[PDB]
Amino acid sequence: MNTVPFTSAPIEVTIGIDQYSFNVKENQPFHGIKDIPIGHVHVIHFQHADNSSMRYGYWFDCRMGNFYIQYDPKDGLYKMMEERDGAKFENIVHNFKERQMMVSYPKIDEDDTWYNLTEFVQMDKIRKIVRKDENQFSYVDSSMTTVQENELSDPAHSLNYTVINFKSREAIRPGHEMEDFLDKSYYLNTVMLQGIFKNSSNYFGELQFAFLNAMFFGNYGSSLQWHAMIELICSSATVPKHMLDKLDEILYYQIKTLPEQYSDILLNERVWNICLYSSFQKNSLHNTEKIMENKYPELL
Amino acid sequence: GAMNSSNYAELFNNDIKLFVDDTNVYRVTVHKTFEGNVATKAINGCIFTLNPKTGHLFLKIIHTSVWAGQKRLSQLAKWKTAEEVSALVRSLPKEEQPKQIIVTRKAMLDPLEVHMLDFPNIAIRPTELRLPFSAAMSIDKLSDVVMKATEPQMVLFNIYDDWLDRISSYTAFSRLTLLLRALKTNEESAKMILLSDPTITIKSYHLWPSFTDEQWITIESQMRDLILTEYGRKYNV
Numbered sequence: 016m017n018t019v020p021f022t023s024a025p026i027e028v029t030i031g032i033d034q035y036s037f038n039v040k041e042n043q044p045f046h047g048i049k050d051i052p053i054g055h056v057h058v059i060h061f062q063h064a065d066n067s068s069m070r071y072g073y074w075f076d077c078r079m080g081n082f083y084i085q086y087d088p089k090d091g092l093y094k095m096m097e098e099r100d101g102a103k104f105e106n107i108v109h110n111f112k113e114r115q116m117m118v119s120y121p122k123i124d125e126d127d128t129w130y131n132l133t134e135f136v137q138m139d140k141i142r143k144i145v146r147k148d149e150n151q152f153s154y155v156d157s158s159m160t161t162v163q164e165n166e167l168s169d170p171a172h173s174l175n176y177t178v179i180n181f182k183s184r185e186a187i188r189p190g191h192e193m194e195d196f197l198d199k200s201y202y203l204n205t206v207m208l209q210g211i212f213k214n215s216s217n218y219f220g221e222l223q224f225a226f227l228n229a230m231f232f233g234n235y236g237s238s239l240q241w242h243a244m245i246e247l248i249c250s251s252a253t254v255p256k257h258m259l260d261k262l263d264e265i266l267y268y269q270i271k272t273l274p275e276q277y278s279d280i281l282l283n284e285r286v287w288n289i290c291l292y293s294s295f296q297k298n299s300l301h302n303t304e305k306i307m308e309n310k311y312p313e314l315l
Numbered sequence: 316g317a318m319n320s321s322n323y324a325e326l327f328n329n330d331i332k333l334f335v336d337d338t339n340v341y342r343v344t345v346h347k348t349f350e351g352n353v354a355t356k357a358i359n360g361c362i363f364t365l366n367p368k369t370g371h372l373f374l375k376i377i378h379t380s381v382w383a384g385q386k387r388l389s390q391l392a393k394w395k396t397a398e399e400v401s402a403l404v405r406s407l408p409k410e411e412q413p414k415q416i417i418v419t420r421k422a423m424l425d426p427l428e429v430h431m432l433d434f435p436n437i438a439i440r441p442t443e444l445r446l447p448f449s450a451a452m453s454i455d456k457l458s459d460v461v462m463k464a465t466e467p468q469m470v471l472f473n474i475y476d477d478w479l480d481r482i483s484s485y486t487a488f489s490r491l492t493l494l495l496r497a498l499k500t501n502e503e504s505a506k507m508i509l510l511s512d513p514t515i516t517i518k519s520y521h522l523w524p525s526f527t528d529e530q531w532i533t534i535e536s537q538m539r540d541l542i543l544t545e546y547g548r549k550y551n552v
């Protein structure tokens with residue numbers, strides 16, 4: 016188990032840690048989060064109480080370094096940093112632990128939720144999507160745009176998700192116009208899986224990360240990317256059997272975790288009705304269809 | 316974007332554009348089989364591709380053999396249309412390629428856009444105008460070349476005959492659409508109107524009769540009376 020200690024909490028803030036959240040009051044004696052499960056990537060995220068504008072946060076893996084959070088009164092936000100002095104870090108963490116100034120990552124033992132949302136989400140995958148390589152952790156926020164959104168504006172502060180565009184020369188082979196538009200298998204299997212992502216693990220990686228960023232930050236372009244990546248699979252007549260099964264599992268736990276009250280702005284009615292009812296894979300996502308119908312039947 | 320009544324003069328500016336109509340691409344007769352089921356027999360069809368400024372009509376004849384052994388023919392027809400229009404643009408010198416292609420039915424937008432990804436500067440647009448281009452097969456010379464064809468074939472016409480010598484393209488288009496609307500609402504009457512005077516003939520190199528300016532006004536009036544007549548017979552007004 017690992018720790019993210021905090022210098023202090025000078026401004027009132029709701030803190031997210033993976034799928035959990037808790038309120039910290041202005042100048043409350045808060046000095047961070049302990050018992051963080053080693054083995055998974057994590058995200059710690061923030062929404063200021065005085066300005067719900069800009070949700071922001073940091074993707075990180077405790078195995079890659081000793082990280083901590085300090086508020087920056089010039090830039091006005093809680094920043095992640097790395098302490099390279101291990102001795103200093105253990106000592107700093109042990110005194111706060113002894114004074115019981117830290118919340119405990121509240122993982123119920125029956126609970127595989129976080130694993131199931133991040134199964135394909137390692138830091139090497141995340142590093143391909145964000146650009147800021149002087150740090151071992153990655154900052155995301157509500158308003159960061161995607162490379163595709165810039166095409167349609169700072170490239171340093173962008174999400175590099177792979178551009179999926181069904182009416183593009185990459186998606187459509189000359190001479191197979193109708194075939195490749197109505198059956199996306201070429202684009203999914205040859206262009207994306209064999210060519211850009213390399214395997215279905217880097218591909219489900221970006222998928223899962225796109226959902227998490229949509230949900231935790233309300234990042235609109237991440238939400239477009241998640242829906243695009245689903246639709247490409249569902250709109251392909253030929254998909255490996257093991258990807259369809261794993262996709263059904265991925266989606267089931269995303270749908271299960273989505274707040275009911277965010278369903279109107281996180282779920283695209285067109286994509287989901289197409290995917291579950293019209294597409295080539297309409298009958299191949301049993302678990303996801305069953306949860307969607309019992310949870311969000313309005314949308315369908 | 317969509318073409319409608321607000322930007323109607325854009326059709327007749329100096330930016331090359333084509334209308335594409337696919338109504339008559341896939342044509343069938345429906346008949347009972349010996350066992351009393353129903354089956355279709357396809358007949359020859361055509362793509363109607365028209366420069367509304369010049370009157371140049373690129374009539375691509377669609378021979379029934381292009382459906383042989385194919386499934387979902389109504390859907391294939393939109394893609395076959397888009398393939399043949401793309402082929403036409405590619406066959407034209409650069410300075411003759413259209414800057415815009417306007418499809419008369421919105422179902423043509425994706426198939427054409429996909430076939431023309433190579434031409435990102437050509438705008439593919441729908442239109443809110445209800446154009447009567449389906450009646451193009453009521454023009455005897457066009458119907459004849461379509462039905463006689465034994466192979467795929469493209470035939471080129473000027474659907475304005477020589478009118479542009481005397482009127483603007485705006486007026487020639489207005490004449491054409493009223494003629495086609497009339498043939499679409501009551502074909503027999505429209506043809507009766509067009510030929511009742513044997514002293515006005517159709518030149519071998521033309522589609523419509525050689526009416527004088529004065530006779531065109533009369534003909535136009537009679538066609539409007541016909542469209543109004545039929546509206547009356549239809550709705551009982």
Ligand SMILES: COc1cc(CN)ccc1C
Pocket residue numbers: 020021022023083084085098103104107
């Ligand atoms: C909150 O934890 C730390 C704080 C500082 C400086 N405020 C250095 C290093 C660590 C670990």
Ligand SMILES: COc1cc(CN)ccc1C
Pocket residue numbers: 140141143144175176177211212213217218220221
């Ligand atoms: C997640 O893995 C990848 C992601 C990107 C950029 N969306 C490029 C390449 C790979 C392998």
